[PDB]
Amino acid sequence: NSVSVDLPGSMKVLVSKSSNADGKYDLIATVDALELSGTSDKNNGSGVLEGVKADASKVKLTISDDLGQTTLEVFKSDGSTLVSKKVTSKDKSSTYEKFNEKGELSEKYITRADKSSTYEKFNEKGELSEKYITRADKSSTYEKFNEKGELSEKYITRADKSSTYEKFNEKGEVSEKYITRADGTRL
């Protein structure tokens, strides 16, 4: 029968030459316990697979032609309003997005090859409300944005266990500024 192919994002696709078709390969994959299927013109497991949840949600798996990237989209029953989207590359980096009921981006979680991560949260308007960056060196950045799209809070943490906290007021200039450095030498 069929041949198994590994895919970025810890998934697998089964590829087998199509009989009742012509020059096509049939693809089947099981993803989060849902069966997806499609057909491809190539013999490496690239191509598009689709599925349908029992709530009639549509699931689309796209595998790029050289297998370096997979995209897993979950749509509402209309087949067009996004619910979620997971992109994973071969280098293990990935972007996961969650959308609200009308398809506006609600959360984004990025992971890089060095395993730094960036986590963004959006309001219902769809604008950036929060941003949190963790880095490989163990530094971290926190940003809170107000209703006016202005920065209102920032918190940087460095590898030497130091810190810098800042609050911003109605004017874009800093109003507070904690600066912690070597040991517990505050400011």
XYZ file of N, CA and C in Angstrom:
561
model
N 0.806 -1.216 0.000
C 0.000 0.000 0.000
C 0.858 1.294 0.000
N 0.835 2.023 1.114
C 1.253 3.414 1.149
C 2.553 3.578 1.929
N 3.155 4.755 1.780
C 4.446 5.087 2.375
C 4.271 6.282 3.301
N 4.875 6.193 4.472
C 4.754 7.219 5.492
C 5.818 8.287 5.278
N 5.424 9.556 5.459
C 6.302 10.716 5.357
C 6.157 11.550 6.633
N 7.287 11.928 7.247
C 7.268 12.807 8.415
C 7.137 14.250 7.956
N 6.468 15.069 8.773
C 6.206 16.464 8.450
C 6.503 17.381 9.620
N 6.980 18.587 9.319
C 7.157 19.614 10.341
C 5.863 19.829 11.111
N 5.999 20.092 12.415
C 4.855 20.132 13.299
C 4.444 18.800 13.873
N 5.338 17.807 13.873
C 5.060 16.465 14.380
C 3.806 15.890 13.749
N 3.773 15.857 12.421
C 2.625 15.198 11.812
C 3.170 14.175 10.837
N 2.305 13.297 10.344
C 2.689 12.318 9.331
C 1.626 12.271 8.246
N 2.051 12.065 6.998
C 1.132 11.861 5.879
C 1.468 10.538 5.206
N 0.428 9.792 4.824
C 0.539 8.551 4.073
C 0.296 8.821 2.593
N 1.239 8.393 1.764
C 1.278 8.690 0.343
C 1.192 7.376 -0.418
N 0.277 7.289 -1.368
C 0.229 6.080 -2.187
C -0.206 6.451 -3.593
N 0.415 5.833 -4.592
C 0.086 6.156 -5.975
C -1.389 5.882 -6.245
N -2.037 6.814 -6.935
C -3.462 6.670 -7.209
C -3.673 5.664 -8.329
N -4.618 4.757 -8.117
C -4.964 3.752 -9.126
C -6.009 4.323 -10.078
N -7.225 4.538 -9.575
C -8.337 5.038 -10.374
C -8.141 6.475 -10.853
N -7.072 7.152 -10.442
C -6.710 8.440 -11.010
C -5.550 8.240 -11.988
N -4.774 9.296 -12.224
C -3.724 9.247 -13.234
C -2.635 10.234 -12.851
N -1.412 9.732 -12.676
C -0.303 10.575 -12.270
C -0.526 11.312 -10.971
N -1.477 10.866 -10.166
C -1.755 11.480 -8.882
C -1.302 10.555 -7.764
N -1.079 11.155 -6.610
C -0.778 10.428 -5.397
C -1.867 10.778 -4.402
N -2.450 9.764 -3.771
C -3.408 9.991 -2.696
C -2.700 10.155 -1.356
N -3.137 11.169 -0.604
C -2.589 11.538 0.690
C -3.659 11.358 1.747
N -3.308 10.674 2.830
C -4.153 10.619 4.015
C -3.324 10.986 5.241
N -3.887 11.806 6.126
C -3.204 12.104 7.376
C -4.205 12.109 8.515
N -3.753 11.725 9.692
C -4.594 11.799 10.872
C -3.991 12.838 11.799
N -4.744 13.907 12.059
C -4.239 15.064 12.785
C -5.218 15.408 13.891
N -4.735 15.409 15.137
C -5.592 15.570 16.317
C -6.809 14.666 16.188
N -6.556 13.446 15.737
C -7.526 12.358 15.682
C -8.618 12.597 14.655
N -8.381 13.487 13.688
C -9.281 13.731 12.565
C -8.608 13.312 11.258
N -9.343 12.643 10.388
C -8.789 12.174 9.123
C -8.886 13.260 8.058
N -7.769 13.548 7.412
C -7.719 14.497 6.320
C -7.275 13.762 5.071
N -7.763 14.220 3.925
C -7.384 13.553 2.692
C -7.211 14.557 1.567
N -6.391 14.164 0.615
C -6.282 14.945 -0.592
C -5.551 14.142 -1.635
N -5.167 14.848 -2.704
C -4.391 14.294 -3.804
C -3.325 15.306 -4.190
N -2.212 14.798 -4.712
C -1.062 15.606 -5.092
C -0.554 15.131 -6.441
N 0.145 16.017 -7.142
C 0.889 15.617 -8.327
C 2.311 15.158 -8.011
N 2.802 15.357 -6.787
C 4.166 14.991 -6.434
C 4.152 13.735 -5.575
N 5.325 13.101 -5.458
C 5.447 11.822 -4.767
C 6.174 11.932 -3.425
N 6.191 13.121 -2.802
C 6.949 13.312 -1.570
C 6.076 13.641 -0.373
N 4.756 13.611 -0.518
C 3.902 13.971 0.588
C 3.529 15.445 0.664
N 3.974 16.271 -0.272
C 3.498 17.648 -0.293
C 2.117 17.719 -0.927
N 1.448 18.846 -0.735
C 0.090 18.952 -1.258
C -0.878 19.441 -0.186
N -2.169 19.281 -0.438
C -3.198 19.833 0.441
C -4.105 18.696 0.862
N -4.384 18.616 2.152
C -5.361 17.675 2.674
C -6.473 18.454 3.353
N -7.684 17.911 3.326
C -8.784 18.600 3.977
C -9.606 17.631 4.806
N -10.359 18.209 5.713
C -11.231 17.438 6.568
C -12.334 18.346 7.036
N -13.257 17.745 7.769
C -14.450 18.419 8.250
C -14.784 17.846 9.625
N -14.749 18.690 10.649
C -15.235 18.286 11.957
C -16.756 18.116 11.940
N -17.237 17.442 12.992
C -18.650 17.170 13.210
C -19.468 18.432 13.466
N -18.850 19.527 13.908
C -19.561 20.811 13.902
C -19.549 21.486 12.515
N -19.084 20.780 11.483
C -18.930 21.251 10.104
C -17.777 22.244 9.928
N -16.940 22.453 10.955
C -15.678 23.174 10.791
C -14.835 22.517 9.713
N -14.146 23.332 8.920
C -13.274 22.823 7.869
C -11.811 22.878 8.327
N -11.041 21.848 7.983
C -9.638 21.708 8.378
C -8.812 21.543 7.108
N -7.798 22.382 6.946
C -6.966 22.384 5.746
C -5.519 22.236 6.177
N -4.844 21.218 5.668
C -3.415 21.050 5.906
C -2.689 21.282 4.593
N -1.800 22.254 4.571
C -1.002 22.544 3.388
C 0.441 22.189 3.678
N 1.021 21.362 2.821
C 2.419 20.971 2.927
C 3.153 21.529 1.712
N 4.094 22.453 1.953
C 4.886 23.058 0.881
C 5.664 21.998 0.090
N 6.044 22.380 -1.136
C 6.518 21.429 -2.143
C 7.814 20.750 -1.733
N 8.669 21.438 -0.991
C 9.905 20.841 -0.523
C 9.821 20.339 0.921
N 8.620 20.328 1.519
C 8.348 19.812 2.855
C 8.930 20.682 3.953
N 9.409 21.886 3.644
C 9.959 22.691 4.711
C 8.944 23.423 5.572
N 7.655 23.356 5.233
C 6.655 24.157 5.936
C 5.280 23.505 5.835
N 4.575 23.431 6.963
C 3.200 22.965 7.023
C 2.340 24.067 7.629
N 1.112 24.141 7.131
C 0.111 25.102 7.576
C -1.156 24.320 7.885
N -1.677 24.484 9.072
C -2.856 23.760 9.510
C -3.891 24.799 9.895
N -4.924 24.938 9.081
C -5.964 25.936 9.304
C -7.270 25.266 9.709
N -7.922 25.840 10.698
C -9.259 25.451 11.090
C -10.126 26.657 10.806
N -11.134 26.449 9.964
C -12.156 27.388 9.538
C -13.502 27.038 10.176
N -14.367 28.052 10.282
C -15.754 27.829 10.668
C -16.498 27.091 9.553
N -17.804 26.869 9.775
C -18.586 26.080 8.827
C -18.659 26.749 7.462
N -18.520 28.088 7.408
C -18.517 28.797 6.130
C -17.299 28.460 5.294
N -16.324 27.745 5.865
C -15.128 27.357 5.142
C -14.169 28.489 4.849
N -14.367 29.664 5.465
C -13.585 30.870 5.158
C -13.211 31.702 6.381
N -14.030 31.732 7.416
C -13.685 32.418 8.651
C -12.711 31.551 9.441
N -11.506 32.060 9.682
C -10.519 31.286 10.432
C -10.868 31.211 11.918
N -10.626 30.032 12.477
C -10.622 29.762 13.920
C -9.202 29.668 14.459
N -8.344 28.935 13.744
C -6.955 28.773 14.181
C -6.055 28.489 12.983
N -4.769 28.794 13.137
C -3.774 28.542 12.094
C -2.417 28.221 12.709
N -1.848 27.082 12.342
C -0.575 26.656 12.898
C 0.391 26.450 11.745
N 1.459 27.233 11.714
C 2.506 27.102 10.706
C 3.743 26.580 11.417
N 4.312 25.480 10.923
C 5.565 24.961 11.468
C 6.542 24.723 10.326
N 7.785 25.142 10.522
C 8.847 24.957 9.540
C 9.727 23.768 9.919
N 10.616 23.383 9.002
C 11.488 22.252 9.299
C 12.451 22.573 10.447
N 12.940 23.816 10.531
C 13.844 24.220 11.612
C 13.184 24.281 12.993
N 11.948 23.788 13.115
C 11.126 23.665 14.330
C 10.506 24.991 14.770
N 10.692 26.079 14.023
C 10.028 27.336 14.344
C 8.557 27.289 13.921
N 7.722 28.040 14.629
C 6.293 27.945 14.364
C 5.572 29.222 14.782
N 4.408 29.418 14.169
C 3.501 30.517 14.465
C 2.126 29.901 14.650
N 1.517 30.141 15.807
C 0.166 29.672 16.073
C -0.716 30.884 16.309
N -1.824 30.952 15.580
C -2.757 32.056 15.707
C -4.127 31.518 16.066
N -4.785 32.239 16.960
C -6.155 31.992 17.364
C -6.958 33.226 17.009
N -8.173 33.001 16.506
C -9.032 34.078 16.023
C -10.340 34.078 16.803
N -10.983 35.242 16.893
C -12.293 35.315 17.540
C -13.385 34.837 16.574
N -14.647 34.969 16.992
C -15.765 34.377 16.261
C -15.984 34.995 14.889
N -15.449 36.192 14.637
C -15.554 36.835 13.331
C -14.254 36.748 12.516
N -13.260 35.986 12.983
C -12.034 35.837 12.227
C -10.974 36.886 12.474
N -11.183 37.790 13.441
C -10.155 38.739 13.864
C -9.106 38.035 14.704
N -7.828 38.306 14.422
C -6.738 37.713 15.192
C -6.846 38.075 16.665
N -6.827 37.061 17.515
C -6.972 37.249 18.953
C -5.696 36.960 19.734
N -4.969 35.905 19.375
C -3.684 35.587 19.997
C -2.726 35.048 18.950
N -1.441 35.395 19.095
C -0.355 34.899 18.254
C 0.790 34.415 19.143
N 1.257 33.192 18.904
C 2.354 32.615 19.673
C 3.405 32.139 18.683
N 4.563 32.799 18.706
C 5.677 32.535 17.805
C 6.767 31.831 18.593
N 7.365 30.829 17.974
C 8.469 30.073 18.532
C 9.563 30.059 17.482
N 10.785 30.401 17.881
C 11.916 30.453 16.967
C 12.819 29.242 17.152
N 13.745 29.056 16.202
C 14.599 27.870 16.243
C 15.411 27.810 17.534
N 15.939 28.957 17.993
C 16.681 29.037 19.252
C 15.792 28.876 20.485
N 14.487 28.692 20.280
C 13.448 28.535 21.302
C 13.172 29.816 22.087
N 13.580 30.967 21.563
C 12.917 32.189 21.976
C 11.448 32.125 21.546
N 10.612 32.911 22.217
C 9.189 32.919 21.929
C 8.638 34.329 22.074
N 7.599 34.608 21.299
C 6.918 35.892 21.323
C 5.437 35.596 21.385
N 4.760 36.178 22.367
C 3.353 35.918 22.618
C 2.639 37.262 22.570
N 1.759 37.426 21.603
C 1.013 38.659 21.447
C -0.464 38.384 21.683
N -1.111 39.304 22.389
C -2.542 39.257 22.659
C -3.183 40.530 22.128
N -4.343 40.380 21.477
C -5.045 41.471 20.816
C -6.418 41.698 21.446
N -6.908 42.939 21.374
C -8.282 43.196 21.797
C -9.264 42.802 20.688
N -10.566 42.948 20.982
C -11.603 42.598 20.010
C -11.546 43.496 18.781
N -11.139 44.757 18.958
C -10.804 45.625 17.835
C -9.716 45.000 16.956
N -8.957 44.045 17.491
C -7.902 43.385 16.752
C -6.537 44.028 16.885
N -6.396 45.035 17.747
C -5.133 45.723 17.961
C -4.357 45.118 19.122
N -3.032 45.186 19.000
C -2.093 44.723 20.012
C -2.424 45.279 21.392
N -2.671 44.383 22.331
C -2.924 44.735 23.716
C -1.754 44.370 24.614
N -1.079 43.247 24.328
C 0.050 42.780 25.134
C 1.044 42.049 24.257
N 2.322 42.143 24.637
C 3.417 41.459 23.954
C 4.419 40.965 24.989
N 4.734 39.675 24.959
C 5.683 39.080 25.891
C 6.725 38.279 25.113
N 7.991 38.668 25.236
C 9.106 38.026 24.533
C 9.977 37.334 25.563
N 10.187 36.042 25.397
C 11.243 35.352 26.111
C 12.341 35.014 25.106
N 13.591 35.142 25.528
C 14.731 34.892 24.660
C 15.529 33.703 25.177
N 16.441 33.221 24.328
C 17.280 32.086 24.708
C 18.185 32.418 25.892
N 18.776 33.615 25.916
C 19.607 34.028 27.046
C 18.836 34.143 28.362
N 17.509 33.954 28.342
C 16.597 34.026 29.490
C 16.132 35.454 29.805
N 16.456 36.423 28.953
C 15.835 37.730 29.097
C 14.353 37.651 28.707
N 13.576 38.651 29.130
C 12.157 38.702 28.792
C 11.701 40.153 28.738
N 10.757 40.431 27.837
C 10.190 41.760 27.634
C 8.675 41.686 27.731
N 8.082 42.574 28.521
C 6.635 42.656 28.627
C 6.173 44.053 28.250
N 5.182 44.120 27.369
C 4.621 45.382 26.916
C 3.109 45.294 27.013
N 2.525 46.279 27.679
C 1.092 46.478 27.759
C 0.772 47.770 27.032
N -0.281 47.729 26.223
C -0.711 48.857 25.416
C -2.120 49.246 25.824
N -2.375 50.548 25.878
C -3.654 51.023 26.368
C -4.676 51.033 25.234
N -5.879 51.529 25.551
C -6.954 51.609 24.566
C -6.586 52.509 23.396
N -5.703 53.487 23.616
C -5.308 54.435 22.581
C -4.135 53.936 21.748
N -3.864 52.634 21.764
C -2.741 52.103 21.019
C -1.404 52.623 21.508
N -1.383 53.252 22.680
C -0.133 53.740 23.247
C 0.447 52.706 24.195
N 1.770 52.672 24.271
C 2.402 51.890 25.317
C 2.029 52.477 26.669
N 1.679 51.611 27.612
C 1.468 52.044 28.980
C 2.318 51.287 29.983
N 2.864 50.130 29.621
C 3.682 49.415 30.593
C 4.776 48.652 29.860
N 5.979 48.647 30.432
C 7.108 47.915 29.869
C 7.957 47.330 30.991
N 8.424 46.105 30.800
C 9.155 45.393 31.847
C 10.201 44.514 31.176
N 11.470 44.920 31.226
C 12.567 44.141 30.655
C 13.334 43.451 31.787
N 13.732 42.204 31.543
C 14.467 41.376 32.492
C 15.651 40.798 31.746
N 16.843 40.939 32.318
C 18.080 40.582 31.642
C 18.650 39.290 32.218
N 19.715 38.806 31.568
C 20.298 37.517 31.932
C 20.970 37.557 33.302
N 21.558 38.697 33.678
C 22.188 38.863 34.984
C 21.172 39.024 36.132
N 19.911 38.631 35.923
C 18.816 38.746 36.894
C 18.456 40.201 37.222
N 18.854 41.152 36.371
C 18.527 42.566 36.517
C 17.154 42.873 35.910
N 16.687 44.110 36.111
C 15.328 44.461 35.707
C 15.224 45.942 35.368
N 14.219 46.262 34.555
C 13.856 47.647 34.260
C 12.350 47.698 34.023
N 11.625 48.289 34.973
C 10.185 48.479 34.871
C 9.867 49.941 34.604
N 8.919 50.184 33.702
C 8.541 51.538 33.334
C 7.048 51.613 33.081
N 6.424 52.634 33.657
C 5.032 52.970 33.413
C 4.978 54.236 32.567
N 4.016 54.293 31.658
C 3.829 55.432 30.779
C 2.450 56.008 31.039
N 2.353 57.329 31.043
C 1.083 57.977 31.316
C 0.502 58.547 30.023
N -0.579 59.313 30.168
C -1.320 59.926 29.068
C -0.409 60.582 28.027
N 0.800 60.974 28.434
C 1.844 61.417 27.519
C 2.909 60.333 27.403
N 3.435 60.158 26.191
C 4.311 59.042 25.877
C 5.629 58.957 26.628
N 5.860 59.856 27.581
C 7.097 59.859 28.348
C 6.956 59.002 29.604
N 8.092 58.489 30.078
C 8.096 57.611 31.241
C 7.690 58.391 32.487
N 6.850 57.770 33.318
C 6.438 58.332 34.598
C 7.084 57.645 35.791
N 7.332 56.341 35.703
C 8.134 55.587 36.657
C 9.346 55.008 35.932
N 10.307 54.499 36.713
C 11.435 53.759 36.154
C 12.229 53.017 37.226
N 11.761 51.830 37.613
C 12.581 50.930 38.417
C 13.750 50.434 37.583
N 14.958 50.535 38.133
C 16.170 50.035 37.493
C 16.896 49.203 38.541
N 16.784 47.880 38.447
C 17.527 46.973 39.312
C 18.718 46.425 38.535
N 19.904 46.468 39.157
C 21.150 46.038 38.524
C 21.813 44.897 39.292
N 23.128 45.003 39.502
C 23.887 43.947 40.166
C 23.327 43.657 41.556
N 23.046 42.379 41.816
C 22.485 41.896 43.091
C 21.116 42.548 43.268
N 20.821 43.152 44.416
C 19.555 43.827 44.604
C 19.693 45.334 44.684
N 20.675 45.897 43.979
C 20.928 47.338 44.026
C 19.888 48.051 43.165
N 18.794 48.448 43.812
C 17.628 49.041 43.168
C 17.922 50.470 42.692
N 16.864 51.188 42.326
C 16.942 52.608 42.014
C 15.531 53.199 42.058
